[PDB]
Every structure is written in C-alpha cells, then in structure tokens.
Amino acid sequence: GSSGSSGNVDAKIAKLMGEGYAFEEVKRALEIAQNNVEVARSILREFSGPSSG
Amino acid sequence: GSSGSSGNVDAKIAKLMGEGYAFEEVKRALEIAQNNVEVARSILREFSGPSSG
C-alpha cells in the first residue's frame, strides 16, 4: 500500500468492522497489530475464524 | 525500526525465540504479524503473556 507507517486508527477499526466483527474485537486487533489493517485481519482470523461455503 | 518492508524471516524467528518463546509459537506469531518482529511481540503477549518481577 501507498503508506506503511501509521496514519489513522478509527478508519482502520471501521475497515475491520466491515469484515463482520464486533468493535471490541477489532479494537483489540488494531492495538496488537501496531494499528495495521493488513495485519489485524490475521488476528481476527485467529480469534474468531469466520466460515464460508 | 530502520526498515520494515518484509525482509528475511529466519532473522525474525531467531529473534523472538531469544525472548523465551518456543519455535511453534514464534513461527505462528510472525505469520500473523505479516512477518514483523515489532508486531509479533504483541501477539506472543496475547498467546503467552509471561510474568516479570
């Protein structure tokens, strides 16, 4: 992506919440992930594990 | 740090292992962290979260 050294936090939370996760879980993921969306998606994947099919 | 665009993976695994975590745990943490030591620490703090004092 165009920038990889911080920027915003709330926009990232909104991003991950759109994947179908609760705000609380997302806030946890962005905290741990040093506020990175690309990285937070892996955290929520582990803590939730969504289905498909 | 000075540079964060991915890089060698072994050099990251071998770093977190020196903290006190097992290979299994470290390799996992790095994969979740998009192979980044700085974020892997926060992940190991969630799967282990060791004590001090």
Coordinates of N, CA, C and O in Angstrom, one line a residue:
Chain A
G1 N 0.8 -1.2 0.0 CA 0.0 0.0 0.0 C 0.9 1.2 0.0 O 2.0 1.2 0.5
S2 N 0.3 2.4 -0.5 CA 1.0 3.7 -0.6 C 1.8 4.1 0.7 O 2.8 4.7 0.5
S3 N 1.3 3.9 1.9 CA 1.9 4.3 3.1 C 1.9 3.1 4.1 O 0.8 2.5 4.2
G4 N 2.9 2.8 4.8 CA 3.0 1.7 5.7 C 3.5 2.1 7.1 O 3.7 1.3 8.0
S5 N 3.6 3.4 7.4 CA 4.0 4.0 8.7 C 2.9 4.9 9.3 O 2.9 6.1 9.0
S6 N 2.0 4.3 10.1 CA 0.8 4.9 10.7 C 0.0 5.8 9.8 O 0.0 5.6 8.6
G7 N -0.9 6.6 10.4 CA -1.8 7.5 9.7 C -3.0 7.7 10.6 O -3.1 8.8 11.2
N8 N -3.9 6.8 10.6 CA -5.2 6.8 11.3 C -5.5 5.5 12.0 O -4.9 4.5 11.7
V9 N -6.4 5.6 13.0 CA -6.8 4.4 13.8 C -8.3 4.1 13.6 O -8.6 3.0 13.2
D10 N -9.1 5.1 13.8 CA -10.6 4.9 13.7 C -11.0 4.3 12.3 O -11.9 3.5 12.3
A11 N -10.3 4.8 11.3 CA -10.7 4.4 9.9 C -10.3 2.9 9.8 O -11.0 2.1 9.1
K12 N -9.2 2.4 10.4 CA -8.8 1.0 10.4 C -9.8 0.2 11.2 O -10.1 -0.9 10.7
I13 N -10.4 0.7 12.3 CA -11.3 0.0 13.1 C -12.6 -0.2 12.2 O -13.0 -1.3 12.0
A14 N -13.1 0.9 11.5 CA -14.2 0.8 10.6 C -14.0 -0.2 9.6 O -14.9 -1.0 9.2
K15 N -12.8 -0.3 9.0 CA -12.4 -1.2 8.0 C -12.7 -2.7 8.4 O -13.5 -3.3 7.8
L16 N -12.0 -3.1 9.5 CA -12.1 -4.5 10.0 C -13.6 -4.7 10.5 O -14.0 -5.9 10.3
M17 N -14.3 -3.8 11.1 CA -15.6 -4.0 11.5 C -16.5 -4.4 10.3 O -17.4 -5.2 10.4
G18 N -16.1 -3.9 9.1 CA -16.8 -4.3 7.8 C -16.6 -5.7 7.4 O -17.3 -6.2 6.6
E19 N -15.6 -6.4 8.0 CA -15.4 -7.8 7.7 C -16.4 -8.7 8.5 O -16.4 -9.9 8.3
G20 N -17.2 -8.1 9.4 CA -18.2 -8.7 10.2 C -17.7 -9.1 11.6 O -18.0 -10.3 12.0
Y21 N -17.0 -8.2 12.3 CA -16.5 -8.4 13.6 C -17.0 -7.3 14.6 O -17.2 -6.2 14.1
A22 N -17.1 -7.6 15.9 CA -17.5 -6.6 16.9 C -16.4 -5.6 17.1 O -15.2 -5.9 17.1
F23 N -16.8 -4.4 17.4 CA -15.9 -3.2 17.6 C -14.8 -3.6 18.6 O -13.7 -3.2 18.4
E24 N -15.2 -4.2 19.7 CA -14.3 -4.6 20.8 C -13.1 -5.5 20.3 O -12.0 -5.2 20.6
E25 N -13.5 -6.5 19.5 CA -12.5 -7.5 19.0 C -11.6 -6.8 18.0 O -10.4 -7.0 17.9
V26 N -12.2 -5.8 17.2 CA -11.4 -5.1 16.2 C -10.5 -4.1 16.9 O -9.3 -4.1 16.5
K27 N -10.9 -3.5 18.0 CA -10.0 -2.6 18.7 C -8.9 -3.3 19.3 O -7.7 -2.8 19.3
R28 N -9.1 -4.6 19.7 CA -8.0 -5.5 20.2 C -7.0 -5.7 19.1 O -5.8 -5.5 19.3
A29 N -7.5 -6.1 17.9 CA -6.7 -6.4 16.8 C -5.9 -5.3 16.4 O -4.7 -5.4 16.1
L30 N -6.4 -4.0 16.3 CA -5.6 -2.9 15.9 C -4.6 -2.5 16.9 O -3.6 -1.9 16.5
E31 N -4.9 -2.7 18.2 CA -3.9 -2.4 19.3 C -2.7 -3.3 19.1 O -1.6 -2.8 18.9
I32 N -2.9 -4.6 19.1 CA -1.9 -5.6 18.9 C -1.1 -5.4 17.6 O 0.2 -5.3 17.6
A33 N -1.8 -5.2 16.5 CA -1.2 -5.0 15.1 C -0.5 -3.7 14.9 O -0.2 -3.4 13.8
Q34 N -0.1 -2.9 16.0 CA 0.5 -1.6 15.8 C -0.3 -0.8 14.8 O 0.3 -0.1 14.0
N35 N -1.6 -0.8 14.9 CA -2.6 -0.1 14.1 C -2.4 -0.4 12.6 O -2.3 0.5 11.8
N36 N -2.4 -1.7 12.2 CA -2.2 -2.1 10.8 C -3.4 -3.0 10.4 O -3.5 -4.1 11.0
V37 N -4.2 -2.6 9.4 CA -5.3 -3.3 8.9 C -4.9 -4.7 8.3 O -5.6 -5.7 8.5
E38 N -3.9 -4.7 7.5 CA -3.4 -5.8 6.7 C -3.0 -7.0 7.7 O -3.1 -8.1 7.4
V39 N -2.5 -6.6 8.9 CA -2.0 -7.4 10.0 C -3.2 -7.8 10.9 O -3.2 -8.9 11.4
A40 N -4.1 -6.8 11.2 CA -5.2 -7.0 12.1 C -6.1 -8.1 11.6 O -6.8 -8.8 12.4
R41 N -6.3 -8.2 10.3 CA -7.2 -9.2 9.7 C -6.7 -10.6 10.1 O -7.6 -11.4 10.4
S42 N -5.4 -10.9 10.3 CA -4.9 -12.2 10.7 C -5.2 -12.4 12.2 O -5.4 -13.6 12.5
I43 N -5.3 -11.4 13.0 CA -5.6 -11.5 14.4 C -7.0 -11.9 14.6 O -7.3 -12.9 15.3
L44 N -8.0 -11.2 13.9 CA -9.4 -11.5 14.0 C -9.6 -12.9 13.4 O -10.5 -13.6 13.9
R45 N -8.9 -13.3 12.4 CA -9.0 -14.7 11.8 C -8.7 -15.7 12.8 O -9.5 -16.7 12.9
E46 N -7.7 -15.5 13.7 CA -7.3 -16.4 14.8 C -8.4 -16.4 15.9 O -8.9 -17.5 16.3
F47 N -8.7 -15.2 16.4 CA -9.7 -15.1 17.5 C -11.1 -15.4 17.2 O -11.9 -15.7 18.1
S48 N -11.6 -15.3 15.9 CA -12.9 -15.6 15.5 C -13.0 -16.8 14.6 O -13.7 -17.8 14.9
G49 N -12.4 -16.8 13.4 CA -12.4 -17.9 12.5 C -13.8 -18.0 11.7 O -14.5 -18.9 12.0
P50 N -14.0 -17.0 10.8 CA -15.3 -17.0 10.1 C -15.4 -18.1 9.0 O -14.4 -18.5 8.4
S51 N -16.6 -18.5 8.8 CA -16.9 -19.6 7.8 C -17.3 -19.0 6.4 O -17.5 -17.8 6.3
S52 N -17.3 -19.8 5.4 CA -17.7 -19.6 4.0 C -18.4 -20.8 3.5 O -18.7 -21.7 4.3
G53 N -18.6 -21.0 2.2 CA -19.3 -22.1 1.6 C -20.8 -21.9 1.5 O -21.2 -21.8 0.3
Chain B
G1 N 11.5 0.5 13.3 CA 12.9 0.3 13.2 C 13.4 1.0 12.0 O 12.7 1.8 11.4
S2 N 14.6 0.8 11.5 CA 15.2 1.5 10.3 C 14.4 1.1 9.0 O 14.3 2.0 8.2
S3 N 14.0 -0.1 8.9 CA 13.3 -0.6 7.7 C 12.3 -1.6 8.1 O 12.6 -2.5 9.0
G4 N 11.1 -1.7 7.5 CA 10.0 -2.6 7.9 C 9.4 -3.3 6.7 O 8.4 -4.0 6.9
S5 N 9.9 -3.2 5.5 CA 9.3 -3.8 4.3 C 9.7 -5.3 4.3 O 10.8 -5.6 3.8
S6 N 8.9 -6.2 4.9 CA 9.1 -7.6 5.0 C 10.6 -7.9 5.4 O 11.0 -7.6 6.5
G7 N 11.4 -8.6 4.5 CA 12.8 -9.0 4.8 C 12.9 -10.5 5.1 O 12.0 -11.3 4.9
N8 N 14.1 -10.8 5.6 CA 14.4 -12.2 6.0 C 13.4 -12.7 7.0 O 13.0 -11.8 7.8
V9 N 13.1 -13.9 7.1 CA 12.1 -14.4 8.0 C 12.8 -15.1 9.2 O 12.5 -14.9 10.4
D10 N 13.9 -15.9 8.9 CA 14.7 -16.6 9.9 C 15.2 -15.6 10.9 O 15.0 -15.9 12.1
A11 N 15.7 -14.5 10.5 CA 16.2 -13.4 11.4 C 15.2 -12.9 12.4 O 15.6 -12.3 13.4
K12 N 13.9 -13.1 12.1 CA 12.8 -12.6 12.9 C 12.5 -13.7 13.9 O 12.3 -13.5 15.1
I13 N 12.4 -15.0 13.4 CA 12.1 -16.2 14.2 C 13.1 -16.3 15.3 O 12.8 -16.3 16.5
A14 N 14.4 -16.3 14.9 CA 15.5 -16.5 15.8 C 15.6 -15.3 16.8 O 16.3 -15.5 17.8
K15 N 15.0 -14.2 16.5 CA 15.0 -13.1 17.5 C 14.0 -13.3 18.6 O 14.4 -13.4 19.7
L16 N 12.7 -13.5 18.2 CA 11.7 -13.8 19.3 C 12.0 -15.0 20.1 O 11.7 -15.0 21.3
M17 N 12.6 -16.0 19.5 CA 12.9 -17.3 20.2 C 13.9 -16.9 21.4 O 13.9 -17.6 22.4
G18 N 14.7 -15.9 21.2 CA 15.7 -15.4 22.2 C 15.0 -14.8 23.4 O 15.6 -14.7 24.5
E19 N 13.7 -14.3 23.3 CA 13.0 -13.7 24.3 C 12.7 -14.8 25.4 O 13.1 -14.7 26.5
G20 N 12.2 -16.0 24.9 CA 11.8 -17.1 25.7 C 10.7 -17.9 25.2 O 10.1 -18.7 26.0
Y21 N 10.2 -17.8 23.9 CA 9.1 -18.5 23.3 C 9.6 -19.6 22.5 O 10.7 -19.5 21.9
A22 N 8.8 -20.7 22.3 CA 9.1 -21.9 21.5 C 9.0 -21.5 20.0 O 8.4 -20.6 19.6
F23 N 9.6 -22.4 19.2 CA 9.7 -22.2 17.7 C 8.2 -22.2 17.2 O 7.9 -21.3 16.3
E24 N 7.4 -23.1 17.6 CA 6.0 -23.2 17.2 C 5.3 -21.9 17.3 O 4.7 -21.4 16.4
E25 N 5.4 -21.3 18.5 CA 4.7 -20.0 18.9 C 5.3 -18.9 18.1 O 4.5 -18.0 17.6
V26 N 6.6 -18.8 18.0 CA 7.2 -17.7 17.2 C 6.8 -17.8 15.8 O 6.4 -16.7 15.2
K27 N 7.0 -18.9 15.1 CA 6.7 -19.0 13.7 C 5.2 -18.6 13.4 O 4.9 -17.9 12.4
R28 N 4.3 -19.0 14.4 CA 2.9 -18.6 14.3 C 2.8 -17.1 14.4 O 2.2 -16.5 13.5
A29 N 3.3 -16.5 15.5 CA 3.3 -15.1 15.7 C 3.8 -14.3 14.5 O 3.1 -13.3 14.1
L30 N 4.9 -14.7 13.9 CA 5.4 -14.0 12.7 C 4.4 -14.0 11.6 O 4.2 -13.0 10.9
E31 N 3.8 -15.2 11.3 CA 2.9 -15.4 10.2 C 1.7 -14.5 10.3 O 1.2 -13.9 9.3
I32 N 1.2 -14.3 11.5 CA 0.1 -13.5 11.9 C 0.5 -12.0 11.7 O -0.3 -11.2 11.1
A33 N 1.6 -11.6 12.2 CA 2.2 -10.2 12.2 C 2.7 -9.8 10.8 O 3.3 -8.7 10.7
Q34 N 2.4 -10.5 9.7 CA 2.9 -10.2 8.3 C 4.4 -10.1 8.4 O 5.1 -9.2 7.8
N35 N 5.0 -11.1 9.0 CA 6.5 -11.4 9.3 C 7.1 -10.1 9.7 O 8.1 -9.6 9.1
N36 N 6.7 -9.6 10.9 CA 7.3 -8.4 11.5 C 7.5 -8.6 13.0 O 6.6 -8.9 13.8
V37 N 8.8 -8.5 13.5 CA 9.2 -8.7 14.9 C 8.4 -7.7 15.8 O 7.9 -8.2 16.9
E38 N 8.3 -6.5 15.5 CA 7.6 -5.4 16.2 C 6.2 -5.8 16.6 O 5.8 -5.5 17.7
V39 N 5.5 -6.4 15.7 CA 4.1 -6.8 15.9 C 4.1 -8.2 16.6 O 3.3 -8.4 17.5
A40 N 4.9 -9.1 16.2 CA 5.0 -10.5 16.8 C 5.1 -10.5 18.3 O 4.5 -11.3 18.9
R41 N 5.8 -9.5 18.9 CA 5.9 -9.3 20.3 C 4.5 -9.2 20.9 O 4.2 -10.0 21.8
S42 N 3.6 -8.3 20.4 CA 2.3 -8.1 20.9 C 1.4 -9.4 20.8 O 0.5 -9.5 21.6
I43 N 1.7 -10.2 19.8 CA 1.0 -11.5 19.5 C 1.4 -12.5 20.6 O 0.6 -13.1 21.2
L44 N 2.7 -12.6 20.8 CA 3.2 -13.5 21.8 C 2.7 -13.1 23.2 O 2.5 -13.9 24.1
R45 N 2.5 -11.8 23.4 CA 2.0 -11.3 24.7 C 0.5 -11.7 24.9 O 0.1 -11.7 26.0
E46 N -0.2 -12.1 23.8 CA -1.6 -12.5 23.9 C -1.6 -14.0 24.0 O -2.4 -14.5 24.9
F47 N -0.8 -14.8 23.3 CA -0.9 -16.2 23.4 C -0.1 -16.8 24.6 O -0.4 -17.9 25.1
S48 N 0.8 -16.0 25.2 CA 1.6 -16.4 26.4 C 1.5 -15.4 27.5 O 1.0 -15.7 28.6
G49 N 1.9 -14.1 27.2 CA 1.8 -13.0 28.2 C 2.6 -13.4 29.5 O 1.9 -13.4 30.5
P50 N 3.9 -13.7 29.4 CA 4.6 -14.1 30.6 C 4.7 -13.0 31.7 O 4.4 -11.9 31.5
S51 N 5.1 -13.5 32.9 CA 5.2 -12.7 34.1 C 6.7 -12.1 34.3 O 7.6 -12.7 33.7
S52 N 6.8 -11.1 35.0 CA 8.1 -10.4 35.4 C 7.9 -10.0 36.8 O 6.8 -9.7 37.3
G53 N 9.0 -9.8 37.6 CA 9.0 -9.4 39.0 C 9.5 -10.6 39.7 O 8.9 -11.0 40.7

